[PDB]
Structures are given as C-alpha cells and as structure tokens.
Design a protein around this ligand. Sequence first.
Ligand SMILES: CCCCCCCCCCCCCCCCCC(=O)OC[C@H](COP(=O)(O)OCCN)OC(=O)CCCCCCCCCCCCCCCCC
Ligand SMILES: NC(=O)C1=CN([C@@H]2O[C@H](COP(=O)(O)OP(=O)(O)OC[C@H]3O[C@@H](n4cnc5c(N)ncnc54)[C@H](OP(=O)(O)O)[C@@H]3O)[C@@H](O)[C@H]2O)C=CC1
Ligand code: SF4
Lengths: 127, 183, 340, 177, 78, 68, 89, 349
Amino acid sequence: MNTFIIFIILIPIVGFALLAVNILLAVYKPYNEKLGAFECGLTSFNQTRLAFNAAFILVAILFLPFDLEISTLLPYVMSIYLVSNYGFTIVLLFLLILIIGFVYEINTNALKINKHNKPNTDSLIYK
Amino acid sequence: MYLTYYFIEITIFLAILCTIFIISAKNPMVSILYMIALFVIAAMYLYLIGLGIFSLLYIMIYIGAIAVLFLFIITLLDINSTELSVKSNIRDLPLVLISLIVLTISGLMIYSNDSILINKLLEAFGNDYNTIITQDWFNIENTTLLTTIGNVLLTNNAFILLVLAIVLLLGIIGPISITMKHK
Amino acid sequence: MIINIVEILIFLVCVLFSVAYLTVAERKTLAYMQRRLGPNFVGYYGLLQAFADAVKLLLKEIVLPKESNYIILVISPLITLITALIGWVVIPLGPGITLGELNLGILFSLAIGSLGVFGSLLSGWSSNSKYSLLGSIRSTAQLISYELILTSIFIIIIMFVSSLNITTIIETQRVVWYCIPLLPLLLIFFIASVAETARPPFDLTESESELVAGYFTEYSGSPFVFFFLAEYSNIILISAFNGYLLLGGYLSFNYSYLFNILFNDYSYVSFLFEGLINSSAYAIKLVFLMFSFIWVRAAFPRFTYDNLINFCWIILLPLLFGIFLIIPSTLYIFDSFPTL
Amino acid sequence: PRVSSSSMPTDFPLPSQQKPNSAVDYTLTTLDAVANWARQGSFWPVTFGLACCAVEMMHVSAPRYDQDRLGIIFRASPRQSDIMIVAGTLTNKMAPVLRQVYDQMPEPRWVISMGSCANGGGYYHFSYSVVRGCDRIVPVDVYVPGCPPTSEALMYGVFQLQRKMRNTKITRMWYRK
Amino acid sequence: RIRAFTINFGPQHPAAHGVLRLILELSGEEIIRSDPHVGLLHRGTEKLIEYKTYMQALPYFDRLDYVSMMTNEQVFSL
Amino acid sequence: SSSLYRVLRNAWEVGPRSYWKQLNSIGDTKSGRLVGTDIYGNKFYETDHQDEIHLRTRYVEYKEKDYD
Amino acid sequence: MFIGTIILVLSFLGFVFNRRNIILAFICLETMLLGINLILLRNSVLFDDISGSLFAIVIIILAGVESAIGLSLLVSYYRLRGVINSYGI
Amino acid sequence: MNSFENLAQDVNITRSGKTLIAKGTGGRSSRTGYTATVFGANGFLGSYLTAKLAKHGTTVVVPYREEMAKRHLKVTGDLGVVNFLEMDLRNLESIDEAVRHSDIVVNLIGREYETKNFNYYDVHVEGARRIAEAVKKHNIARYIHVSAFNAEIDSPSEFNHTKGLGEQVTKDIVPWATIVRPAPMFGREDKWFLDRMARSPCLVSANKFQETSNPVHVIDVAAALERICFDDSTVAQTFELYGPQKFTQKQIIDMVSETLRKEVRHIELPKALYQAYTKATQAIWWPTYSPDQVERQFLSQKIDPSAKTFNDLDLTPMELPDLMFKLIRPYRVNVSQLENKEKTFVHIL
Ligand SMILES: CCCCCCCCCCCCCCCCCC(=O)OC[C@H](COP(=O)(O)OCCN)OC(=O)CCCCCCCCCCCCCCCCC
Ligand SMILES: NC(=O)C1=CN([C@@H]2O[C@H](COP(=O)(O)OP(=O)(O)OC[C@H]3O[C@@H](n4cnc5c(N)ncnc54)[C@H](OP(=O)(O)O)[C@@H]3O)[C@@H](O)[C@H]2O)C=CC1
Ligand code: SF4
C-alpha cells in the first residue's frame, strides 16, 4: 500500500461525488425548447456532411511521424554516456535524415492554406 | 495478501471482454473508445508483468498519437455503419466457432516440441510452478531497461535505427504527397 | 497505514484549495492591470469567491441536448478532471517528497499530458453539430501541435541529466539552474505552455469560433465545474513542469551557514524548517509563473489558426531542430557526457 | 381506508410572516442561507443587450462602477447564465429569438428588464415593428426604469434582485411553510 | 460543385455587436459568400418622425447611432 | 491608493470595533469626520486625506443590516 | 501468452467478419499489433533479455507509421467519393 | 379582428347579481368582466386553464404556494389581469381571502403522494371542505371542483376513496357545484403518462399492462373546463371527460415506441416486491411514484353513464395517435443515388 495508488483511486471518488451532488441536489425540469444545440439564439438545419481543407487533416496525419521520432530520441538520452563519441554520430545522422524530410515539408508549404482573395492581378487592356 | 494473486488472470478476462465491445458497438467512435480502453488494459498487464517503462510508452505513443489520429479521422469524415443485426451474422457464426477453436488451439500449439500433437497442447497449461528469484550482487549501476535499449539501438543495431529513419521519412513524405494537389 | 492516508489527504486539500484561489487571484490581478478592484463582496477581502461560484454551480441543473450522447457528455468532464489531477503525484515539494516516488517520473508526466487532449476532441462529438465539430478539430490540432515542442523541450533538458527521475534533476540543478544557460528555451517553453492549455494569448475556441463559449458552450453545473477545475489544474501543473526542469525546483540558496548558526542537532523542528524553506522556494517559483500567465493574458490579442500553425510548424520547430543539433554537440566538444 | 379524521391547524403563518422555532427550522434556514448566498455572490448574466442600453451595461463593466467587485461576469451563453438582461428594444422580428435564448437557461433563472424600451415599448410604443415590453415574451422579475437607465440605477436593480434572492426560501418551501 | 456549409453569426454572439445576423457560407475556412440580415433592431423611427413636430422629433436622432449623440443631433439641426 | 499602509493607518484611526463593522459593511477602511446624521439614521462622513481619488471623499455608514 | 494470443485471435476474427464499416477494420489491425507485442514482451521477460524488447520498440514505431500512411490512404479514398460505404471498399 | 370566443354575448349577469359588461373586441388588452380564482394554477392542468382564462381578459386570481413557479403565469395575461397572492391551505384567512372577490372559482388541489404534512385525506376532502365552506359563506356563483376519474368511496385505493369523499363533501356544502371528472391526461411535459414513458430506465409495473383507460389531451380538458365555466346550464352536474377510444398500457407503450423508434424497457415484476420498493422510495424528497398508485394499476376506467360528456359542451377531443408525434418529438433519435450524386461535389478543397 503506497500512497501512489490511494491517489489514482481517490481523484475519481471525488469526481463521482461532485457529479453525484449535482445530480441529487439540482432540479431536472426539461422540455423541448430547452433541449437543442446552441447557435446564437437561432435554430437551423445542420448539413449532413461538410467539406474541409487538406491542411486540417494533414496537421494530425503529419503529427505522428514527428512524434515517433521524439520518442525514438528518448532511448538515446538515457544512454548518452555509454555510447560516447559513437552513438553521438549515429544520433546525428538519424536527426539529419529526419531534418531533410522536414525541409521537404516546409518547402512544399503543406500546412499552409492559401487565400482565394486575389486582388485582380490582370490589368485593363482595352479593345 | 492473496487477493493480489489473480490480477493477471483478471486482466486477461478483462481484455477478452473489451474486444467483444470493440467488434459490436452501434456508434463507431464508441468502439474506438473501447480500443483506447484495451490499450489501458495492455499497459496494466505490462506494469503487472514487471515492465513499467513500456506501459507509459504505450500510453504515450498508442493512446496519445495513434488513437488521437483515429478519433480525429472519424470526426470530420463520413462513415456509414450497420448495426450488429442477428440476421446478417448468424450465417457467419459456424465458421466463427470453427475458427475460434482451431486458431486458438493452434496458437497455443507452437510453444512446445513433442512430436505427439496432444503433448504439445498440455505443455501450454503446465505453468503452475513458481519460479525462484535469487539476488545476485553482480551489477553496480542503475542501467534501467531504457538505457539498454539505447545502447543496443545505437551500437549493435545502429543500422536498424537508420533504416528506421528512412521509414519515418517515408511516413512524412507519403501522406503529404498524396494530399498535396500541387498547383 | 495511518501515515500515508493523512499525507495524501493534506496534499489533496492543499492542491484542491490552491486551484480554487488561483481563479480569485486571476480576477484580482486582471482587475488591477485594468485599474479596477477585483471581487470584495464575498469574503472579508474578497476571498472564498471561488466557493461562491462552486456552490452555486453545483446547484444549476444539467441539460443534455437532443443531438447528444448523454454518457460521453458527462464522462469527458470526469476524464479531463482526473487527467488534469493525476499529474500532481510526481512533483517534489522537496528532496524525495512526492506522492509516489518512481524512477521515471518524467515519462509519467509526459504520458499524462498526452491523455489530456481527448476531453477536448471527444467533447466535440457529444452534441454533434457541424459548427461545433470543426471547432473541436481546430482545438485538438493546436493542442497536439504544441504538445510536440513541449515533449521536445523535455528531452533537451534530460540530455543534461540522463535520468528520468525528477528529484534527480533538481539535485543535479544545485550547481546551476537550467534557465540561465538555456535562456531562449525558457521563452519558447513558456509560450508552448501558454499554448498547451489554450490560454487567451493563443486561444481561438472560446472567443473566435462559431460557438460563443468554446467547445463546452452547451453545458451547466457539474460538467462546467469539472472543466473549469481542469483548466486551472493544467495551469499550475505545466507551471510545476517549468518549476522543476527549467527553474529551480525547491532550490533557493545554499543555507548551510544559516543552519550552522541556528541549529545544533537533527530534530523535527529542523526538518519542519527545512521543508518550509524548500516548499517556499518552489511556491514562489510557481506563483511568479502563474502571475506571468495572467500578465500575458492582459496585454494581447489572439491568433488566427493560420498564424498559429505557421507559428508552431514553420518558425519554432526548425529553430528547435537547430537546438537538437547544437546542444549534444556542445556536450560533445567538451568532454562532458552525463552519467546515469 | 382507515383514516377519516384530520388534525390540521386553522391558524398557521404565511411564508412572508413566519419565523423559525424548531431545530429543524434553524437547520433548514442555515442551509437555505448558504444556497441563497451562493446564488448572490456569484451572479452570471447573459449579455443580451442590443441597443442604447447595452453601452450603459458596458459602463457597469467599466472601472468606475465595477461589476467584478460584486461577483458579476458575462458568461455569454445562456446555458451557463443564471439570469438574462433584456437591455434594449424588442422588435417583432426578435421576440422568438429572445424567447429561444430564455428557453435554454438552467432552471434557477431570473430576468431583469433594463431600460424603458424593454418594459412597455418605450419611446417606440406606437410602432408597427416593436413588442410592447418583454413582459409579453419572458416573465420578468425586476424592472429597471430609465431610458438610458443610469449605471447607478442598473446596479440598484441588481441589488434589488439579490434581495429577492435572499427570501427565495428554496429549502423552507419544501417543508411547506 | 463547391458545396458550401452555411452558418450564422446570429444575435447571441459577443463579436456580432448584439444585433447582427450574418449568414456566412464557407468552404473549409474561406468565406465564398456573405449575407448580412438586419431588421432585428428596426423600429420604424422614420415613420414616427412624420407624426411628431421637429422639436419632438429631436430625440429620434440621438436614439439611433447611440454611440455619438451630439453629431446625430447636429445633422438634423443643421 | 491601494496600499497596505493606508488601510493599516485607517484601521488604527477608526478603531477595531468600528473597523470590524466597516469590514462587514464595505471592503474599504475609511476614516471620516461626521458631517451629519440622517432623519432615518445614517451617519455620513467626509475624508480629508491626501491619497484619495476623486469621488471617494464622501460616504454613508448605514444603520440596518439590510441597506438601500 | 494467453492474453496476447487471445487478443490476436479475437481481433483477427473481428477483422475478418467485419461487414459493418471500415474503421473497425483499422482498429482490429491495431489491436492485433498490440497482441503480437504482448506475446513478445512476455518472452523477453521470461528469457532475461532486451532482445525481444528491441524488436518490440521497433514494431511500435512501425505500427505508428502504418497508421499514418494508411489513414492518409483513407483520406485519398474519401476525396473522390464523399461517403464511405458500410459494406466496405 | 379578435373576438370573445368564450362568451355567448356582450352583457352577462352572474347568479349572485353582479352585472358584467364586456369591453371592446377580443384579445389581450380587452377585459371580459369576470373575476376567477384558480386554485393550483401552477399545476399541469391549471397552467393551460389560466392561459385560456386570461387570454380574453378575465381577471385571474392565483393563490400560489411557492414564489418561483408562478412567474411563468405572469406572461399569459395583460397588465392587471393576473393577481398573485400567497396562500396556505392551513390558514383559513387566506382561503377566505382568495375567493372573496371571485365571480367564479375552481380548485384543482390534488396530490398523488402522501406527504409528511398532508395525507390523502388532508388534500382531497379536507382542503376541498375548507374551500367549499368559504365559497358557501361568500355566495359565489359557479363553484366547480375537479376530481379524478374512477372516484368512488367503495374503492380500495386511498386516492379514489378520498376523491369520492371529497365529491360528497363538496356536494353537501355547496349544492350548486359543478363536479368534473377527467380521464388520464396526456399533455406536454405531463405528470406520469407520456413524460414517464419517454424517459424511464426500466418502466416497471404490475398487471401485465392490461388496465383500460382512455387518455385526453389537456388543452381539450382546459377548453372543456372553460366552456363549462361560463354557461349556467352546467350548474349541479357531474361531467365525464374521456377520450375517443379505449387503450391498454402495452398498446400505448407500443405506440410510443413506434414513434420514438426505440425499444422502451419492460420488467413486470410481482406486486408485493414492487410495493415494498415504492415503500422504500417514499423516504426521499423529490416526488416518486406512489405506493397507492400501485393499486390504481389494477383499477380501470369505470365510466358513469349518468353523466355528461364532451358532446354536451360542443367539443370533440383529439385522439392520442394523431398527437403522439408532437409530444414525443424531442426524444426521437433521428444510398446509391446519393453516391451517384456525391461524385460531383468537392470534399478536400
Ligand atoms: C547568433 C545566435 C543566433 C541568434 C538568434 C537566437 C535564436 C534563439 C532565440 C529563440 C527565441 C525564440 C522566441 C520565439 C520567437 C518567435 C518569433 C516571433 O516573434 O514570431 C514571429 C511571427 C511573425 O512571423 P513572420 O511571418 O516572419 O512575420 C513577418 C511579417 N511580414 O509573429 C508571431 O507569430 C506572433 C508572435 C507570437 C509570440 C508569442 C507571444 C506569447 C507570449 C509572450 C511571452 C512573453 C514572456 C513573458 C514572461 C515573463 C517575462 C518576465
Ligand atoms: N392523470 C392526471 O393528471 C389526473 C389528475 N386529476 C386531478 O386534476 C387535478 C390537477 O391535475 P394535474 O395538473 O395533473 O396535477 P397537479 O400538479 O396540478 O396537482 C397539484 C396541484 O395542486 C397543488 N397542490 C397539491 N397539494 C396542495 C396543497 N396541500 N395545498 C395547496 N396546493 C396543493 C399543487 O401546488 P404546486 O403547483 O406548487 O405543486 C399543484 O398546483 C388534481 O386534482 C388531480 O387529482 C384527475 C385524474 C387524473
Ligand atoms: S431604452 Fe432608451 S437608450 Fe435603451 S435602447 Fe431604448 S431608447 Fe435606446
């Protein structure tokens, strides 16, 4: 019985107790015009599916291969004394192989969303 | 004292239970939430066996990146799903039962090396002997498990770390190159 | 058995109070920045304001709208609550004073801050609206995108200790703090800390999105008190992370000479006096840091999502790659690698 | 059907005229004081204000007449606001919108009517597109009069509403006073 | 076919200055078509000026544009 | 001003019983000079002191716990 | 070996008899990978070596990049057809 | 323009002698002339009744029990129409006081569960005795008393027993009281009929649901009640207010479940265990299902043929299946041509 596991058992019972004192002590009393989602005092139709930009999905698809490197650098940082002068160069090469894929990403401007607010580039040629 | 004995078996049962709520759930993202629960049961088993390091690597990497990716997909995309009706999967049930029996037993078979097939299976169940743990005073420093992984990923298998860098590079280049629409 | 239940009672009751008075202190100092008093109508000098909010907030009813899953709507406050509260174990209030001392406390502190994203994203699908879902998308994408550089700052700091234990870091820190060599790291860890909670320098959801009140707009009662507690527990928790790995954890000065003047022998008044000094140093670090959060809230407008993603991925992260390359190379040039 | 006789009193005080006597009465009075005082010291309106009287509300947010010092903050969503302030006119195009905002707020709810355009039409009383006060739409508890009702007077209406919250008697009512 | 998701910045919104309904059709985050609705504050002040004398019509002007009163007074007086 | 010295010296000048009454009454600690009393019974005070902002000089001390 | 084999076999049969949607097929694949991990990590603990833990920490990363690649494949599949079928691809 | 629908005429005289000239056209800002006291006007029936009553400008006198409910009545009448005044059933001065100026008066004080302060005998026959004794003392035209369906003294259920006793006592005191007996009443956020079936974790009962009772919409009961209130043909008459067609509970729950498109729960455990469970849940402050409401699960709709229906006052009640869809709307949950048409839109930009 350490005092580590009283805590992880003990936070929930506090949360369940506060949720229970709300469910017990406040009234319930609903109806139909109370129910329904909030948008600014006006109901509307929700569209069944909507379109999105490729950068929105690309942030979190692209997030994971950078996250997997940051957890791959975590075995090295604990053994940094043992692999003196040698695991250093291997981790350099590993990080450099990553950095060139990153500069691919920043050269393509993959996460940037353009604006279609073009200021009418084309001048006025007449006749 | 012996209340703390059956924990491993409990997790096994609990893990079994969780998979039935994964494959049979009306909403998709509720079943992906049951999968997050199954990662938590796995990390419980990995602390319970003695690998406290891995449990937090599972909660970091699988729960915090892979499941966040999955939930993030299911939000802003369209997926139809049909409920577990009895009429569509009652035709599957006999091949389900036959494959449960065969795949379960035959997964339990290759841990063992008698030529007789029935002696292979029973050696799967003869584990009730308690291993004796002896204290040896031969180690002088706190090389944890993560230190040893960082010594073997970096010296003996440095090339696997480097080919792995090529794989992580590919995992960057690929999703980009699909979802660009260059110009 | 009596001694570990009274210590966890007193640490619980010290932390759960200190997250309540944080919000009072916030309204106070934000008022005086804007040349007006804070609350003073609820206690003798305005204290126990948060208790007035909390006791009323528990009396409001819970409404669960018709588009919603009612379970998910009530379970995301519980999981966000516990995840913002489970991370209070591993902080030390002195040398080896934790609520569980484990050998790898950073990996735990880094895996719990990974679990806090869900109660944003999952809460977007409860009451599924297409104007709410996309706001939850923007919030979750920001939240993970700055968690990346958070985790990276950690691993740059553990390059100097090579130990995932936390009081080992603070004992390592006695020779010099880690803020004073790594000064730009303090600035970018502070702004990543402001991002990771979605403070209103870096907010878009609570104010600018198509919901008027963030992703948690449609709530009342217990699902609002749990989110409200979880945000300010997140405030003081990332403040604690800054307090141990970048500023001194419990370290202020040497204080050996003052002891050799005052005391004669080890006794319980001496351990009490040393505990007061150590936790006083940790508390004044943490209080200057919550004042910095409230101070940066006052002075600034907010971000477009384009500004935000262009900030994290294009500006801060390449600089961070340069930091990855420069710091083990500096530990390399001179003959100094840290030993386990 | 054994019971056939009643023993109820013919003189029993009204709730406005009743003072506590028993230990259960002092207990429920103390518990009630805690609940009513919690409803006062935190006091959250939705910022419905739409016209002339909304700037006058932003003088209650100003540093001369502060509202933070009373406990007042604008949670700008009716799901969390205790109360509503109709601060400005009510046309015929907004009367369902004003009701749909009022419909949503959780059940201990009040509303104060700020201004003279918000109680009885006001300056625009004889107009084709106006509601002659939000009394027709929402059930209002405190009327604050003034065409720009002075920030002094709006705060006084807030103090009057908090006095109405002193004598709400949510727990004495259940004892059937 | 660029299908656009439609929203309102309806009345109950802090950044809508109270009365502004604003139908916005967006594709992702860009706005491809905007449409302000208005009339939620409209009271017919101009039908009412016609039934009052000029001295009685004088407050109808600082009621509108209620942030800057003396200028509205000034335009009608001039 | 908002200093501690001002509230400390006004607490010393007004005295501890009237300090406790003004603290249950208002948040501030104020020292005035008794200009007059009300027909309803409400004492009024005016402040000499140098560190007083504009519109702070005059105030009421009421009689009832329920004040208007 | 019971927990890893049972997770692998039940996840495998839930993958095979999936007819209801596609995201169940992805998550059945990931629960399979978890089961192979569990079997190997136990074999590392019982044999006193990091060796299987070396293969484990590599296959963690490969399961990650498999998720990243294949979910971008799904977004490509969804780009031309604004709905995903229930019966499958 | 608007019109006084409830009135036969302009000039109406009461039975007491007061002469009432109705003013103006119909509507909010006009006044009919009547003063009415509705007891229990915060209740479920009373809110619709005083909605319809203050709609044309009859001055409504509302004796209230709590200050926080009654706010929702102030919107339904014009300024000066609805007048709230506090009342306890125990203080005879307040019941004396509320009916003092009323041209008509109705009570609907009826509580389904026993309290610590009031049993069934206290609210149903003794409160009615106090109100009817006041109405006899003040000579009020048109006292009308609502009582339950199946209200007889011989019945074993205590509710129905003391309702029949309350009817007999208000017949003894005032001979000229109209007594009105409605069926189960479905409405919007009703008490125990449809609001209970739309949200219930288990829906447990006895009887295997085979009790027979027909339900009436509540705006129909309020319309029939106001149409009673104003004509003098309905003095000293007992009215049955029952809907068009007879139902059983399993039939109603199948009708609710086919419009929810969700399977509502069914338990049907034995009676004695159920009774002991309700006995256990009586000790809790919020209103719970009554233990004598178990006995009313057996008692079915026994209609008096010697009474007057909707047919007398010219009303046709609306049926439950035509109106099930509207009241159950918020709890409602919610292929190849689409996929041939969705291959022309843009989804990734
Ligand atoms: C020779 C050696 C090399 C020398 C160089 C040294 C390198 C290491 C230094 C690293 C320190 C980095 C600190 C973070 C830098 C952020 C850069 C920045 O300001 O953002 C720029 C960005 C605009 O981007 P851009 O498109 O380029 O603008 C061009 C306009 N046409 O604009 C923006 O994005 C908006 C700015 C956001 C900034 C965040 C502010 C939030 C909080 C401020 C924290 C203040 C801390 C106070 C704490 C208490 C202090 C006591
Ligand atoms: N299925 C049904 O609904 C049936 C109902 N009826 C009868 O119709 C009448 C009203 O029906 P319904 O609207 O559904 O239920 P109600 O909610 O209206 O019943 C209670 C009403 O009477 C008040 N009340 C209860 N006890 C007292 C008391 N001691 N003193 C003063 N007032 C009291 C209540 O005050 P408060 O508002 O504060 O709660 C409330 O107004 C009742 O007489 C009922 O017996 C007829 C047959 C079936
Ligand atoms: S009440 Fe007066 S100031 Fe307010 S909006 Fe109306 S006319 Fe303008």
